[PDB]
Every structure is written in C-alpha cells, then in structure tokens.
Amino acid sequence: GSHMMDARIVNALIGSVYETIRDVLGIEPKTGKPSTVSHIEIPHSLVTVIGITGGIEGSLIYSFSSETALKVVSAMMGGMEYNQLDELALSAIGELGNMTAGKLAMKLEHLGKHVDITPPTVVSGRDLKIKSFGVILKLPISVFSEEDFDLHLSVKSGG
Amino acid sequence: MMDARIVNALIGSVYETIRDVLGIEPKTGKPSTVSHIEIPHSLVTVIGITGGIEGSLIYSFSSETALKVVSAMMGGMEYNQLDELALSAIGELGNMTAGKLAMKLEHHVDITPPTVVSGRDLKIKSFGVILKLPISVFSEEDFDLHLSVK
Secondary structure (H helix, E strand, O other): OOOOOOHHHHHHHHHHHHHHHHHHHOOOOEEOOOEEEOOEOOOOOEEEEEEEEEOOEEEEEEEEOHHHHHHHHHHHOOOOOOOOOOHHHHHHHHHHHHHHHHHHHHHHOOOOOOEEEOOOEEEEOOOOEEEOOOEEEEEEEEOOOOOOEEEEEEEEEOO | OOOHHHHHHHHHHHHHHHHHHOOOOOEEOOOEEEOOOOOOOOEEEEEEEEEOOOEEEEEEEOHHHHHHHHHHHOOOOOOOOOOHHHHHHHHHHHHHHHHHHHHOOOOOEEEOOOEEEEOOOOEEEEOOOEEEEEEEOOOOOOEEEEEEOO
C-alpha cells in the first residue's frame, strides 16, 4: 500500500514520455509539472488503460480528444491523412501507450523495480469517468497543442 | 482462448464474486469467440493479467443493471441514481473480483488493480483473441464477460 510515489519512478515516467512520443510520433513533447490528484478527471472521449504488476501495482492511463487522436494516428503513419478512428486507428493509439509503458518498465528494471505490462485496452465514449486505485499521479503533456494529453499513473503499491 | 483451466478460474472468479457480493445465482450462458466487443453498456471493469497469461478480464453492464447491482450490495436497499456511491460500489465489485481472481489462482500469474470506466456509448478496444460470455444476473444477459489473451 503506497501513500507516496518515488521520484525515480516519476523521472522514469517523464523520460519514457519524451523518448516515446518522439520516436513514435516524430514530435518532441513538452511534459508538464507532475502532481498528485484526488482522482482522475477526464475531459476527453478517448482513454487507454495499461495494467502494471510486480514491482509496482497499478496502471498507466492516457487520454485525449477525438481530434488529438487523429493527429497522433496520422503522425504515427508518416503524416498521412486519417479521418475516422476505425479499428486500425484505435490500435495505433493503444500501441502508443504500449510503447510508453514498455519504455517505463525498461527504465524501471534498473532502479530495482521489475514490472509486467498488460496489453492496452482502449475505451471511446461520452461522459467518461474513471476509478483508479492507489496514489494517482497526473502528468500534463503537450504533444501538438498545449496540454492536449493526459497521462495518469495509478500506484496501488510499489512506491 | 487456450488452457481451459485458465478460463475456468477466470470465469469462476466473476461468477463467484457475483454470488458472494450481489447475493444471487447467475446463469453463465454459452461461451463464444467474438471478433471484437459490441458493448451496449455504460459501465466497464478492466482487470489486467500478467505473467503466465497476458491480457484482461473485462465485465460490463448497462446503467439500469448498474443500479440493480448497487442495490444488492447496499443491504438490498433502493438505488435510483448512478452517483459516486454507486461507482465506488462497482469499484468495490471490481476489487472483489480481482480479490477472487487472485485467491483462486494460486496453482504463476499476477493480477492488476481494477479500473472502472463509466460513461455513454462505451466502445471498447481489446488486444488479443476475445472470449465472450453472456451472464444472467437480474435480467436475460445483462452482464457480458470478455476475456482477451495473448
């Protein structure tokens, strides 16, 4: 049962964000200031969940608008036009999360924390609310536009 | 799907949680291998699995079924809105299911803390072969259990 979340974990998260959206999207992101939040407040219609076990128990969750997603997917495909979030689109979105989570695990297994990453599960919908357990950390991220990316790290334990 | 003994404890965790928590006997309908997930629901609970098997245990239901669910857990009282107490209860249903999934799986896999997502017209994307399993608790197939794997 975590009540706090180690700085090394935050810095490994932040590091994984740059390396990831850079290599997968071709864009150097502008991470925000990390902060602990009472719960997850999603304004967006898209949300991706990646479970984490072992070293740390919790998840990694990111979300954005339908608009931002189309850019993301279009960027992930060399910049080619994409106007409908179909199966292929939603898989690209999930993969972005998988990569970020993949880099995080990688960096983490050097600080002593060994973790397993569950495959992503993408959820699109309207008045989305999300219940996460453990200490919730928020990381505002700017990819294309100012704070167009929400990244939340749920830490039930391992902190 | 694969190792049938994996499946049995996976479906058995949801069944047993519904029985102990909601206090009623569900009719776990006939399994099926679907291409994706056609969710006509407002509440979804995701429980990730790592180690041996990789994927997630996901069960979902409508806003109407959700109220009924909350009523069962709340001393059999009456519940008319999907407020925070309702979401906290469904979040609890998740932790029980997760709790049972762990307890029942001691004979090399790890369980992820559950995540409860709620909203309107929830379209869900899962990674891996999916095993759909309808479940009757309060109405005919008001519960739908989805199992995605490697």
